[PDB]
C-alpha cells in the first residue's frame, strides 16, 4: 500500500537475496534499538538526569534548558545516520522513544521497587512531541539547514507545554507550618534523599533583573537557539559516525584508508546485473 | 552506617550532637514518629569542612520507611536550607510517619554546602504493619484532599501512554517493509525519487497536525483545571541560635595523645570554676559517642542507645571542683567504643585533631558544657 | 520606571528607605539641587539577592539632566562603591546642578554588586531654563579654571581629524586606480611583479616616518604641557552605619496573608512594649509606598509625593500600647497602591515572603522603627 514492490523491483533482489533482506533487518533493528536505549540513556541521565528524577527540580530555568540541548544530541546524529544512509524519517523520535523505555525500566525497577520511592515522584517525563515535530519538519523540508532551524526552535519551543499536563498539577500550593511550597517542593521533603539535600537543587532562585512573569518563555527561547546551534553541530558529528574505512598494509608496511564501496551503486552495474 | 568513615578530626570537630531522643521505638503505619535533639557547632571548625553557610537538617534513613512531615530547627520550619553559626547551639525536631514496616537505623544529619553531609547518632526504630495500608491525606490551598502516595500518578502515566502511542506508531509505520538494505541499494544507485511515498507525506502531515493540536490542547485543558499554581519554592531558612548559656567552667588543653596500638583518649586540662558552686565533670561526647562515669550516669537518658554509651571517662582526680580555684586535671576516655568507632585513624589525617563536647555538673543538677579541641599525638605502645 | 517590575519579596526585604527629601520643586539651569534621605539594609534580606559588599548610591534621573556635584552616604564622600551592613541605618545626601529643564521623575538607588540595580521612590522635579545656557565651572588642583561640559572637547575632535585625515589619504592614494578585476587578472596569470610600485614604497617609507614621528612627538607634547597627571581613581569608601537606636518595641510575626484576586495584605504581630511610655502605631513603609493612619498623618512630610501614600492602614486595636504590655495585633494594609506596585505578583515569585518597616510614635512625639517579615499566604477569593 506504499510502493514496496516497485523499491524492491529497483533494487533487483530475487526472493531469496529480500527473504536475508528482512533478516537482516530483523536482526540489526533490534541492536540499534538497544544501542540507542543503553548510550543515550547514559548521555542523558549523566547530563540532564537530575532534573529528571525528582519532581521538584522541574523548575522555570535550568530544566527547560538543559533538558532539551542535551536531549537535541543524540537525535540529530541518528536523524543524519538514518536519513544519509536509508532515507528513513524516524531517528529523533526512536532516540526518544528507546530513552523513555529504559527510563522507565530503572525507575520502575531501580528507583520503585528497590529505593521504595513514589513511582508519581519520578516521572521523567516526555520529550516526544519535539523529536515528532524535528522527524516531521526533515521529511517535508529535506533541508537539513533548514530543518536545523525550525526544528531546533520546535524543540526547544514544544518541552515545556508538552510536560505542563504532567508537572502543572504538581504545582498547586499547599501550606505547611505557615510556610508555603508547591506540592512538589513537599513531595520531595516528605520522602528522605539522604543523598540529596535542598540546597543542591539547581533551580530557579529569582533576581532584581528578572520578569517572573516571562521566566519560562526566555527559558524556552534559550534553549531553542541553542539547538539550532547544537543540531549543525551534531549533525557535522553524524558524518564522524558514519566514517567506515580500513587500515590496509602492503611491502614497505605503509598504512592506507581504504573504503570498501557499493558495487551496485556504481555507473552500470544495474544494468548489467541481467 | 558510613559515619566511622568519615575521617575522625573532622566529625569530631563538626557538629557536636546532644540530647538525642528517638521516639516511639515502635510503632504501627500511618502513625506519628519524632526524633528530637540538640547540636553545637564546634569553634574549633576544620578547615577540610566548609563553613556551614547552607546548612539542611536530613535524615539517615534506609530508605523512604518514614515520609518526613516536617523538620524544625529552634522553632523555624527548615524545609529550605540556611545557614548556621559557628560556636552556636541549635535545637532540632523531625516529625515523621511510619511508611514501611521492619526494623530501621534512623539517624541525624546535618548537611553542609561544600563540606558534605555530617551523619550522627543512630537508634533502631521498628515499624508493624503493611506499606500497601500507607495513607499519607494532605490538604491544598486550593481545597482539595490529596494522597502523596498516590498523586499525580495517573495523569503522568496517561500521558506518557499517549505520546508514547503516538511515537510507536510513527516509528512502526516505516518498519513494516524493507527497510535498510534495498533502500541503501536504490538511493546509492538511483537516488531518492524512488524513496520518497506521497503516502508518507499524508502521514506526516497528519501526524504533525495531530501533534501541535495535543500540546495546545493538553496545555489549555491543564491551565481551565488548575487556573492557580506556585513555582517551585527556593530561598533559604533564618533562625536565631540558642542563647549562649553562662558557663562557669573554663578549660585549656594542654597536651593530649591517643594510643596507635590501642584503644585509648588522654587529654590534660586545666580547668577554671570561676562561679560560686561546686562543680563534677561526668561525661565526655564526641560523634556520638558518650563516655560517662557516675555524675554523667546520674543524669543520663535511660531510652539512649546503649551501644554508644561507654563508662570509661576516669580523672586523675574526680573530685568537684571548688568555686575559685584553678586545677589540672587528666581525662581518660578509654573503652573498645574507640575501635569500633576508629579512633584509630588518626595517624592518616593530614591533621590530627581531636575534639568533643566535656559535660559537668553542679549539687543541684545544673549542667555546663564545654567543646574542648586540641591537637592529639599518637603513641606507639609497640615502639 | 522598572521598580515595579522588580520582584516584591526582593525590594520588599533589600533596602528600606525612609524620610526622603527632594528639593527645589522647581530649579533654574545651573542651581543647585539636593535629593537627601536614609535608607535600612532589611535583616530578612533576600538570598537572590547578594550581600551588599559592593553598594555605590546611584540617581535614577531620565538622562544627566542633573550632574551629580556629589553622593555622601552618612557623612563619607561616596565615589566610590564600598560595602554596607546589613541591620544598620544609612543617611544619604546628593548634591546635584540642574542642566536639562523639563520635568522628571528623580529617584534614589542603591546598585549592589551581584544582586544589582534596587530603586527606591521616585518625585517630579522641574527645571526651567535652557540647555545651552549649562556651565559647570571646575577648578583642578593643578590650578586651572575648567567647564566640565566643555573639557577636553577640541584636543580628542583635534587628534582625531589628524589621524582620520591621515588614514583617509593612506586609503585613497589607492582607491584611484585599477583596484579589484585587472590585479586580481594580473596576479592570476603573471604573479605580483607588476602589481609592486616604487612610488608606492616611497609614499609608504614616507607615511611611517610621518606615523612614527606624529605618535613620538604628541607624546612629548602632552607630557610636556600636563607634567603632573594622577590615575584613575580606585579603592573602596567605608562609612560607620548610623548607631543602634534603642526600640522598646519588640515584635514577632505570627501570620501574614494577601489576596490573590484583591488588593490587601493583612499581617498578625505580636507586639510587645518593654518600654516606660504608650506605643502607638501609625505607618506601615515598603518599597517606598507609605500607608499611614491618624497617628502616621500626624507626623507626616507635607511635601513628600502624594501618589505613593495611601490612607489604608488599620488595626483591629487602634490603641496606644501600654508600657510593660504584650498584644496581639492584626495590620491591615488596603488600597489601590497595591495593585499599582504589583503586590499581586507574589504568587509567581518562588519565595513568597514580604517584608517593610513599620513605625510608632510616643505620647511626646518620639519615633521608633521596626523591620519586620515573614511568608505570606495566598488567599484565593475567587475560589
Ligand atoms: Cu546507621
Ligand atoms: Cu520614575
Not at chain 1, 525497577?109 to 526533515?138: C, E, K, Q, R
Not at chain 1, 557499493?262 to 544494468?271: H, K, Q, R
Not at chain 2, 497528519?206 to 485543558?221: D, E, K, M, S
Not at chain 2, 599518637?378 to 615502639?383: D, G, Q, R, S
Request: proline letters at 7%; charged letters at 15%.
Amino acid at each position: 500500500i506504499f510502493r514496496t514492490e516497485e523499491i524492491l523491483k529497483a533494487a533487483k533482489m530475487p526472493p531469496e537475496a529480500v527473504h536475508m533482506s528482512r533478516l537482516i533487518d530483523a536482526v540489526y533493528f533490534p541492536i540499534l534499538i538497544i544501542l540507542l536505549v543503553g548510550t543515550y540513556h547514559m548521555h542523558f541521565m549523566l547530563l540532564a538526569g537530575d532534573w529528571d528524577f525528582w519532581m521538584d527540580w522541574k523548575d522555570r530555568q535550568w530544566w527547560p534548558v538543559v533538558t532539551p540541548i542535551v536531549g537535541i544530541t543524540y537525535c540529530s546524529a541518528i536523524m543524519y545516520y538514518l536519513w544519509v544512509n536509508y532515507r528513513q524519517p524516524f531517528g529523533a523520535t526512536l532516540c526518544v522513544v528507546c530513552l523513555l523505555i529504559g527510563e522507565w525500566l530503572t525507575r520502575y525497577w531501580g528507583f520503585y521497587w528497590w529505593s521504595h520511592y513514589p513511582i508519581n515522584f519520578v516521572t521523567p517525563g516526555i520529550m516526544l512531541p519535539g523529536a515528532l515535530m524535528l522527524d516531521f519538519t526533515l521529511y517535508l523540508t529535506r533541508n537539513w539547514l533548514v530543518t536545523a532551524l525550525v526544528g531546533g526552535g520546535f524543540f526547544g519551543l514544544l518541552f515545556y507545554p508538552g510536560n505542563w499536563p504532567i508537572f502543572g498539577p504538581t504545582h498547586l500550593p499547599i501550606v505547611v507550618e505557615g510556610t508555603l511550597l508547591s506540592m512538589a517542593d513537599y513531595m520531595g521533603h516528605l520522602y528522605v534523599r539522604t543523598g540529596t539535600p535542598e540546597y543542591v537543587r539547581h533551580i530557579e532562585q529569582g533576581s532584581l533583573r528578572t520578569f517572573g512573569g516571562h521566566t519560562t518563555v526566555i527559558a524556552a527561547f534559550f534553549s531553542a537557539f541553542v539547538s539550532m546551534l547544537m543540531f549543525t553541530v551534531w549533525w557535522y558529528l553524524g558524518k564522524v559516525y558514519c566514517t567506515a574505512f580500513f587500515y590496509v598494509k602492503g611491502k614497505r608496511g605503509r598504512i592506507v584508508h581504504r573504503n570498501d564501496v557499493t558495487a551496485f551503486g556504481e555507473e552500470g552495474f544495474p544494468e548489467g546485473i541481467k | 552506617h558510613g559515619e566511622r568513615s568519615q575521617e575522625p578530626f573532622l566529625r569530631m570537630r563538626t557538629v557536636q550532637w546532644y540530647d538525642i531522643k528517638w521516639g516511639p521505638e515502635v510503632t504501627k503505619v500511618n502513625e506519628n514518629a519524632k526524633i528530637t535533639g540538640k547540636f553545637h557547632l564546634a569553634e574549633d571548625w576544620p578547615r577540610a569542612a566548609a563553613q556551614p553557610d547552607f546548612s539542611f537538617f536530613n535524615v539517615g534513613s534506609p530508605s523512604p520507611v518514614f515520609v518526613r512531615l516536617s523538620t524544625k530547627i529552634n522553632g523555624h520550619p527548615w524545609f529550605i536550607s540556611g545557614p548556621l553559626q559557628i560556636g552556636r547551639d541549635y535545637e532540632f525536631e523531625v516529625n515523621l510517619r511510619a511508611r514501611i514496616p521492619g526494623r530501621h537505623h534512623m539517624h541525624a544529619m546535618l548537611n553542609v554546602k561544600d563540606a558534605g553531609p555530617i551523619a550522627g547518632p543512630g537508634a533502631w526504630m521498628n515499624i508493624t504493619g503493611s506499606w500497601d495500608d500507607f495513607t499519607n491525606p494532605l490538604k491544598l490551598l486550593t481545597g482539595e484532599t490529596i494522597d502523596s502516595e498516590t498523586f499525580n500518578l495517573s495523569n503522568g502515566i496517561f500521558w506518557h501512554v499517549v505520546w508514547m502511542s503516538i511515537g510507536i506508531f510513527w516509528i512502526g509505520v516505516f518498519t513494516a517493509r524493507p527497510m535498510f538494505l534495498p533502500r541503501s541499494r536504490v538511493l546509492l544507485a538511483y537516488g531518492d525519487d524512488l524513496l520518497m511515498d506521497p503516502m508518507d507525506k499524508k502521514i506526516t502531515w497528519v501526524l504533525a497536525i495531530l501533534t501541535l493540536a495535543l500540546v495546545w490542547g493538553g496545555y489549555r485543558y491543564t491551565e481551565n483545571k488548575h487556573p492557580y499554581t506556585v513555582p517551585i519554592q527556593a530561598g533559604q531558612s533564618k533562625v536565631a541560635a540558642l542563647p549562649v548559656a553562662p558557663n562557669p567552667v573554663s578549660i585549656v588543653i594542654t597536651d593530649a595523645n591517643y594510643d596507635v596500638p590501642g584503644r585509648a583518649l588522654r587529654v590534660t586540662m586545666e580547668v577554671t570554676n570561676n562561679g560560686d558552686i561546686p562543680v563534677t565533670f561526668g561525661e565526655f561526647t564526641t560523634a556520638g559517642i558518650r563516655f560517662i562515669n557516675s555524675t554523667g550516669r546520674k543524669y543520663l537518658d535511660p531510652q539512649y542507645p546503649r551501644e554508644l554509651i561507654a563508662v570509661g571517662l576516669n580523672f586523675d582526680d574526680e573530685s568537684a571542683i571548688q568555686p575559685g580555684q584553678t586545677k589540672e586535671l587528666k581525662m581518660e576516655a578509654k573503652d573498645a567504643l574507640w575501635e569500633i568507632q576508629r579512633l584509630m585513624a588518626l595517624l592518616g589525617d593530614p591533621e590530627s585533631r581531636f575534639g568533643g563536647l566535656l559535660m559537668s555538673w553542679d549539687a543541684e543538677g545544673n549542667r555546663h558544657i564545654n567543646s574542648i579541641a586540641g591537637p592529639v599525638i599518637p603513641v606507639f605502645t609497640k615502639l
